[PDB]
Amino acid sequence: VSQVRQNYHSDCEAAVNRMLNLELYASYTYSSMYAFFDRADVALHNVAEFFKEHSHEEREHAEKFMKYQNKRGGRVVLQDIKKPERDEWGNTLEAMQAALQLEKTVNQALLDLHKLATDKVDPHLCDFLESEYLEEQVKDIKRIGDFITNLKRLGLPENGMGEYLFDKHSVKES
Amino acid sequence: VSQVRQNYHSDCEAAVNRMLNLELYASYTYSSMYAFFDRADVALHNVAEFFKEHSHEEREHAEKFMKYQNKRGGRVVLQDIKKPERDEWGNTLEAMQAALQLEKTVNQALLDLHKLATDKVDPHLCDFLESEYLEEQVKDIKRIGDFITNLKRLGLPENGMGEYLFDKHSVKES
Amino acid sequence: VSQVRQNYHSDCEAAVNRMLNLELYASYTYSSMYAFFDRADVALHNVAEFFKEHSHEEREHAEKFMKYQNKRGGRVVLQDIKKPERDEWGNTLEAMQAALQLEKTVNQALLDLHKLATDKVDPHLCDFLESEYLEEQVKDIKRIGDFITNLKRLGLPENGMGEYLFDKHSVKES
Amino acid sequence: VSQVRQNYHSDCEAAVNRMLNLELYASYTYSSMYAFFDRADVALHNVAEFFKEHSHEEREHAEKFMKYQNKRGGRVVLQDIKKPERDEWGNTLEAMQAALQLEKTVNQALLDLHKLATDKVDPHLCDFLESEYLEEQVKDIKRIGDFITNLKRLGLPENGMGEYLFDKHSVKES
Ligand SMILES: [Cl-]
Ligand SMILES: [Cl-]
Ligand SMILES: [Cl-]
Ligand SMILES: [Cl-]
Ligand SMILES: [Cl-]
Ligand SMILES: [Cl-]
Ligand SMILES: [Cl-]
Ligand SMILES: [Cl-]
Ligand SMILES: [Cl-]
Ligand SMILES: [Cl-]
Ligand SMILES: [Cl-]
Ligand SMILES: [Cl-]
Ligand SMILES: [Cl-]
Ligand SMILES: [Cl-]
Ligand SMILES: [Cl-]
Ligand SMILES: [Cl-]
Ligand SMILES: [Cl-]
Ligand SMILES: [Cl-]
Ligand SMILES: [Cl-]
Ligand SMILES: [Cl-]
Ligand SMILES: [Cl-]
Ligand SMILES: [Cl-]
Ligand SMILES: [Cl-]
Ligand SMILES: [Cl-]
Ligand SMILES: [Cl-]
Ligand SMILES: [Cl-]
Ligand SMILES: [Cl-]
Ligand SMILES: [Cl-]
Ligand SMILES: [Cl-]
Ligand SMILES: [Cl-]
Ligand SMILES: [Mg+2]
Ligand SMILES: [Mg+2]
Ligand SMILES: [Mg+2]
Ligand SMILES: [Mg+2]
Ligand SMILES: [Mg+2]
Ligand SMILES: [Mg+2]
Ligand SMILES: [Mg+2]
Ligand SMILES: [Mg+2]
Ligand SMILES: [Mg+2]
Ligand SMILES: [Mg+2]
Ligand SMILES: [Mg+2]
Ligand SMILES: [Mg+2]
Ligand SMILES: [Mg+2]
Ligand SMILES: [Mg+2]
Ligand SMILES: [Mg+2]
Ligand SMILES: [Mg+2]
Ligand SMILES: [Mg+2]
Ligand SMILES: [Mg+2]
Ligand SMILES: [Mg+2]
Ligand SMILES: [Mg+2]
Ligand SMILES: [Mg+2]
Ligand SMILES: [Mg+2]
Ligand SMILES: [Mg+2]
Ligand SMILES: [Mg+2]
């Protein structure tokens, strides 16, 4: 084993690699959403930029898992980054609904990794998840839930004027 | 077709999507190299950071293709991002040799896209490649060639002291 | 011939004069749109100012063709600047639809001039078009396409409130 | 018992006193390493200063345990601080190998205290260890592992020039 490795279970090492892949997958989905809302036949640029920023955030969270893996003496093992489930994202409501489900999927994987770290008595990995991931996850889920409620209030999907207004007022001007 | 689309061939649209995928593939390879040199049993951190920066550069070049696709009225279509060819990168010389070959692969795909844009009489796409890609490519290839020459001069792969010195002197201090 | 003239075909010289006239024609159309939206019975002043700015841009692009003609040793030959096709422009959607078609007309003439410069092996004229015209054209077409999509979303032409909101939010406050 | 004491097990109190002693022991070992590398017949002053700084860090971590003990209502009980295992430290590689083993010894004691705090359902003590100790420990272990890899690369112990270069380049200039 590595000279630095201490109290780091093989199972946790492997689950960290799977988490790295899932963050890369999430980043790629958000990039797809960015590309969709940037289209001339969609043209909701503040929404597009929101998703672009979330793609960059998820990529940074993947990089943090890489750094973590190495700090603990495990080995970063990469797999293919699967393309997103959809090629087009319908409208702001459909996209935000998909984003919510993606954030919950990532959150469940984080919570599952915390259970594993707990089972293997790894308090460093527990701390890492609690301090760097779990609360920012709860915030992102809350924000997207807030958005979905407002998009429904604005009459999505039918109400184009409501969709226009969300883009001007609910997401930061880009 | 899109209302914005003008003088944009289907073939070019598709080749732009393939180029986007290749830039994402290149970014992912550089990330792998970063992760390798960051290891406690490799520990060449300036080299690692060089590759990290090149991964971020390639990702930005992918994003530029997405934006381009939309500007011309084509449709961004994503595919899986294949994992890198190797899981470990040997040493600085082997990595830089792989980097050189990757940059030449990307350059050939850019040159092939320029031939296609020329065949389809698309001067906007030609300009884009010439102004945003081809010269920065030539610079990156030259830099990596310079590095390889210096790594050989320093006695790689056998000469560890030479590898240590390259990391301190040839790549920017991180 | 002029002492400065080198590698400049008569055909290209003449096509540059026609391009100068077309830019002046485009500027004049945008001025008409400005005047329409400035009316007390139309009164969409941010839209008006958008068109005014685009009129000034096209006039500057005409001036650039004049300067070019002289730099290459050709002779600027002016013709009448035809009045715009319409005297009134209906509403923001109709105007933007007309603007899109005008920008595409100008783009096709630029692309036709690039084909001619290519046929006559004039790389300076090719560069000029690529560096000063073709990309800014693609950007203007994309912007107007984005606008049209949003105007449709806002319920134009029937939805006056949507037209009001476009003027406040989609074009820069004047 | 103390008026402030709540949910603080006797066992944890005692283990905190043992941890305080171990941090003082670690500080004293690093001081010995400092003194060795400061010698005129060793004379690697940047290495010496690295160990001096780590001695001061460990002493501060001991002081933090004292403060903790009092905050929780336990009683600081001091024991002798045993002299280091060696009186001379061979060379930079031997010293760093000893440092790695010391950091792992301290880390295991921290992890053992976390297990005890977990057994006695003391989340405050768990937090304290996670927030103030465990991650900085992982960082120090990683740094020393990185160093050992570079010292081997530089040809230690035989290669004096490599040892000289490590002192100039790998540790901060003092
Ligand atoms: Cl290992
Ligand atoms: Cl282990
Ligand atoms: Cl294990
Ligand atoms: Cl990526
Ligand atoms: Cl789809
Ligand atoms: Cl967090
Ligand atoms: Cl909200
Ligand atoms: Cl509604
Ligand atoms: Cl199309
Ligand atoms: Cl077309
Ligand atoms: Cl086609
Ligand atoms: Cl491999
Ligand atoms: Cl370039
Ligand atoms: Cl060089
Ligand atoms: Cl050699
Ligand atoms: Cl002449
Ligand atoms: Cl001539
Ligand atoms: Cl001629
Ligand atoms: Cl005029
Ligand atoms: Cl009319
Ligand atoms: Cl341009
Ligand atoms: Cl827009
Ligand atoms: Cl409506
Ligand atoms: Cl007490
Ligand atoms: Cl108690
Ligand atoms: Cl007790
Ligand atoms: Cl001794
Ligand atoms: Cl810590
Ligand atoms: Cl290092
Ligand atoms: Cl040696
Ligand atoms: Mg394993
Ligand atoms: Mg598939
Ligand atoms: Mg927190
Ligand atoms: Mg977040
Ligand atoms: Mg997150
Ligand atoms: Mg409003
Ligand atoms: Mg097609
Ligand atoms: Mg495969
Ligand atoms: Mg050319
Ligand atoms: Mg250039
Ligand atoms: Mg470059
Ligand atoms: Mg490149
Ligand atoms: Mg003539
Ligand atoms: Mg007439
Ligand atoms: Mg040609
Ligand atoms: Mg340009
Ligand atoms: Mg323009
Ligand atoms: Mg133009
Ligand atoms: Mg007691
Ligand atoms: Mg004794
Ligand atoms: Mg915590
Ligand atoms: Mg912390
Ligand atoms: Mg520390
Ligand atoms: Mg410590």
Side-chain angles (χ1 to χ4, degrees):
Chain A
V1 287
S2 160
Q3 77 204 315
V4 305
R5 195 191 189 104
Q6 186 170 30
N7 194 42
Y8 196 50
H9 201 280
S10 177
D11 290 1
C12 294
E13 177 178 355
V16 165
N17 284 324
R18 292 193 294 276
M19 205 64 232
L20 190 173
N21 186 266
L22 181 63
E23 288 288 4
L24 289 169
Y25 175 81
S27 169
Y28 198 28
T29 286
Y30 280 130
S31 289
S32 180
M33 296 182 183
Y34 155 71
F36 179 73
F37 287 96
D38 180 72
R39 288 175 64 70
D41 65 6
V42 183
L44 294 161
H45 285 295
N46 294 331
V47 174
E49 284 299 320
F50 173 89
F51 292 128
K52 188 171 175 159
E53 290 174 342
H54 279 276
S55 174
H56 293 182
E57 178 177 340
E58 295 316 283
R59 231 280 172 182
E60 285 166 7
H61 287 178
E63 290 163 22
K64 192 178 276 167
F65 278 119
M66 294 194 273
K67 187 84 174 164
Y68 187 85
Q69 187 74 283
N70 280 346
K71 279 167 78 176
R72 292 298 306 273
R75 180 172 225 92
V76 169
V77 178
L78 305 174
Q79 303 295 343
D80 291 353
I81 304 164
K82 294 293 191 174
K83 72 189 179 78
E85 275 295 294
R86 295 173 65 181
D87 294 318
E88 68 82 43
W89 294 99
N91 58 60
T92 308
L93 178 59
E94 291 195 24
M96 290 292 177
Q97 285 167 152
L100 175 66
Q101 291 310 310
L102 177 66
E103 294 293 323
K104 290 184 119 187
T105 295
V106 171
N107 199 31
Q108 190 62 57
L110 289 161
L111 290 168
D112 291 348
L113 184 49
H114 194 286
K115 188 82 194 230
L116 174 64
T118 295
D119 180 62
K120 302 301 194 185
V121 199
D122 191 330
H124 186 271
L125 177 48
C126 286
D127 169 71
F128 177 64
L129 297 169
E130 286 166 63
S131 301
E132 301 295 322
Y133 293 85
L134 295 183
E135 157 64 9
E136 71 85 26
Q137 207 69 21
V138 157
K139 287 182 300 201
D140 286 320
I141 288 165
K142 175 65 161 65
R143 178 103 121 109
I144 295 161
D146 289 354
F147 288 172
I148 292 166
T149 294
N150 278 287
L151 290 156
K152 289 181 176 183
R153 170 180 285 122
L154 282 166
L156 277 282
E158 296 93 345
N159 197 320
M161 174 180 298
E163 193 169 3
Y164 180 87
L165 286 167
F166 177 90
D167 171 275
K168 306 305 159 297
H169 295 286
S170 285
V171 282
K172 91 165 28 63
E173 173 61 45
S174 60
Chain B
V1 287
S2 160
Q3 77 204 315
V4 305
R5 195 191 189 104
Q6 186 170 30
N7 194 42
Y8 196 50
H9 201 280
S10 177
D11 290 1
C12 294
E13 177 178 355
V16 165
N17 284 324
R18 292 193 294 276
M19 205 64 232
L20 190 173
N21 186 266
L22 181 63
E23 288 288 4
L24 289 169
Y25 175 81
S27 169
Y28 198 28
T29 286
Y30 280 130
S31 289
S32 180
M33 296 182 183
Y34 155 71
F36 179 73
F37 287 96
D38 180 72
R39 288 175 64 70
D41 65 6
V42 183
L44 294 161
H45 285 295
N46 294 331
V47 174
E49 284 299 320
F50 173 89
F51 292 128
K52 188 171 175 159
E53 290 174 342
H54 279 276
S55 174
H56 293 182
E57 178 177 340
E58 295 316 283
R59 231 280 172 182
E60 285 166 7
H61 287 178
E63 290 163 22
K64 192 178 276 167
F65 278 119
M66 294 194 273
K67 187 84 174 164
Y68 187 85
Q69 187 74 283
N70 280 346
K71 279 167 78 176
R72 292 298 306 273
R75 180 172 225 92
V76 169
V77 178
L78 305 174
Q79 303 295 343
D80 291 353
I81 304 164
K82 294 293 191 174
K83 72 189 179 78
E85 275 295 294
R86 295 173 65 181
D87 294 318
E88 68 82 43
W89 294 99
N91 58 60
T92 308
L93 178 59
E94 291 195 24
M96 290 292 177
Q97 285 167 152
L100 175 66
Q101 291 310 310
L102 177 66
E103 294 293 323
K104 290 184 119 187
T105 295
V106 171
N107 199 31
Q108 190 62 57
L110 289 161
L111 290 168
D112 291 348
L113 184 49
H114 194 286
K115 188 82 194 230
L116 174 64
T118 295
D119 180 62
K120 302 301 194 185
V121 199
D122 191 330
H124 186 271
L125 177 48
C126 286
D127 169 71
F128 177 64
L129 297 169
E130 286 166 63
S131 301
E132 301 295 322
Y133 293 85
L134 295 183
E135 157 64 9
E136 71 85 26
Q137 207 69 21
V138 157
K139 287 182 300 201
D140 286 320
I141 288 165
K142 175 65 161 65
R143 178 103 121 109
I144 295 161
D146 289 354
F147 288 172
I148 292 166
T149 294
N150 278 287
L151 290 156
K152 289 181 176 183
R153 170 180 285 122
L154 282 166
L156 277 282
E158 296 93 345
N159 197 320
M161 174 180 298
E163 193 169 3
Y164 180 87
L165 286 167
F166 177 90
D167 171 275
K168 306 305 159 297
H169 295 286
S170 285
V171 282
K172 91 165 28 63
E173 173 61 45
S174 60
Chain C
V1 287
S2 160
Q3 77 204 315
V4 305
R5 195 191 189 104
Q6 186 170 30
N7 194 42
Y8 196 50
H9 201 280
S10 177
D11 290 1
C12 294
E13 177 178 355
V16 165
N17 284 324
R18 292 193 294 276
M19 205 64 232
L20 190 173
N21 186 266
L22 181 63
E23 288 288 4
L24 289 169
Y25 175 81
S27 169
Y28 198 28
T29 286
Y30 280 130
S31 289
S32 180
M33 296 182 183
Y34 155 71
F36 179 73
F37 287 96
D38 180 72
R39 288 175 64 70
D41 65 6
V42 183
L44 294 161
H45 285 295
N46 294 331
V47 174
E49 284 299 320
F50 173 89
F51 292 128
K52 188 171 175 159
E53 290 174 342
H54 279 276
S55 174
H56 293 182
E57 178 177 340
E58 295 316 283
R59 231 280 172 182
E60 285 166 7
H61 287 178
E63 290 163 22
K64 192 178 276 167
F65 278 119
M66 294 194 273
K67 187 84 174 164
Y68 187 85
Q69 187 74 283
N70 280 346
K71 279 167 78 176
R72 292 298 306 273
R75 180 172 225 92
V76 169
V77 178
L78 305 174
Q79 303 295 343
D80 291 353
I81 304 164
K82 294 293 191 174
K83 72 189 179 78
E85 275 295 294
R86 295 173 65 181
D87 294 318
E88 68 82 43
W89 294 99
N91 58 60
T92 308
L93 178 59
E94 291 195 24
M96 290 292 177
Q97 285 167 152
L100 175 66
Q101 291 310 310
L102 177 66
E103 294 293 323
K104 290 184 119 187
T105 295
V106 171
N107 199 31
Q108 190 62 57
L110 289 161
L111 290 168
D112 291 348
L113 184 49
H114 194 286
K115 188 82 194 230
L116 174 64
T118 295
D119 180 62
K120 302 301 194 185
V121 199
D122 191 330
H124 186 271
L125 177 48
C126 286
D127 169 71
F128 177 64
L129 297 169
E130 286 166 63
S131 301
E132 301 295 322
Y133 293 85
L134 295 183
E135 157 64 9
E136 71 85 26
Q137 207 69 21
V138 157
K139 287 182 300 201
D140 286 320
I141 288 165
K142 175 65 161 65
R143 178 103 121 109
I144 295 161
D146 289 354
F147 288 172
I148 292 166
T149 294
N150 278 287
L151 290 156
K152 289 181 176 183
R153 170 180 285 122
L154 282 166
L156 277 282
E158 296 93 345
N159 197 320
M161 174 180 298
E163 193 169 3
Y164 180 87
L165 286 167
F166 177 90
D167 171 275
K168 306 305 159 297
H169 295 286
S170 285
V171 282
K172 91 165 28 63
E173 173 61 45
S174 60
Chain D
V1 287
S2 160
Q3 77 204 315
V4 305
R5 195 191 189 104
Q6 186 170 30
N7 194 42
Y8 196 50
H9 201 280
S10 177
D11 290 1
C12 294
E13 177 178 355
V16 165
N17 284 324
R18 292 193 294 276
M19 205 64 232
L20 190 173
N21 186 266
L22 181 63
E23 288 288 4
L24 289 169
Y25 175 81
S27 169
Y28 198 28
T29 286
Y30 280 130
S31 289
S32 180
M33 296 182 183
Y34 155 71
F36 179 73
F37 287 96
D38 180 72
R39 288 175 64 70
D41 65 6
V42 183
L44 294 161
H45 285 295
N46 294 331
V47 174
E49 284 299 320
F50 173 89
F51 292 128
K52 188 171 175 159
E53 290 174 342
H54 279 276
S55 174
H56 293 182
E57 178 177 340
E58 295 316 283
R59 231 280 172 182
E60 285 166 7
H61 287 178
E63 290 163 22
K64 192 178 276 167
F65 278 119
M66 294 194 273
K67 187 84 174 164
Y68 187 85
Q69 187 74 283
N70 280 346
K71 279 167 78 176
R72 292 298 306 273
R75 180 172 225 92
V76 169
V77 178
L78 305 174
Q79 303 295 343
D80 291 353
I81 304 164
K82 294 293 191 174
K83 72 189 179 78
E85 275 295 294
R86 295 173 65 181
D87 294 318
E88 68 82 43
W89 294 99
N91 58 60
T92 308
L93 178 59
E94 291 195 24
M96 290 292 177
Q97 285 167 152
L100 175 66
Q101 291 310 310
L102 177 66
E103 294 293 323
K104 290 184 119 187
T105 295
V106 171
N107 199 31
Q108 190 62 57
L110 289 161
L111 290 168
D112 291 348
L113 184 49
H114 194 286
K115 188 82 194 230
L116 174 64
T118 295
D119 180 62
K120 302 301 194 185
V121 199
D122 191 330
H124 186 271
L125 177 48
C126 286
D127 169 71
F128 177 64
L129 297 169
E130 286 166 63
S131 301
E132 301 295 322
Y133 293 85
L134 295 183
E135 157 64 9
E136 71 85 26
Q137 207 69 21
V138 157
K139 287 182 300 201
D140 286 320
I141 288 165
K142 175 65 161 65
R143 178 103 121 109
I144 295 161
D146 289 354
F147 288 172
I148 292 166
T149 294
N150 278 287
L151 290 156
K152 289 181 176 183
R153 170 180 285 122
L154 282 166
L156 277 282
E158 296 93 345
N159 197 320
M161 174 180 298
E163 193 169 3
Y164 180 87
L165 286 167
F166 177 90
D167 171 275
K168 306 305 159 297
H169 295 286
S170 285
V171 282
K172 91 165 28 63
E173 173 61 45
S174 60

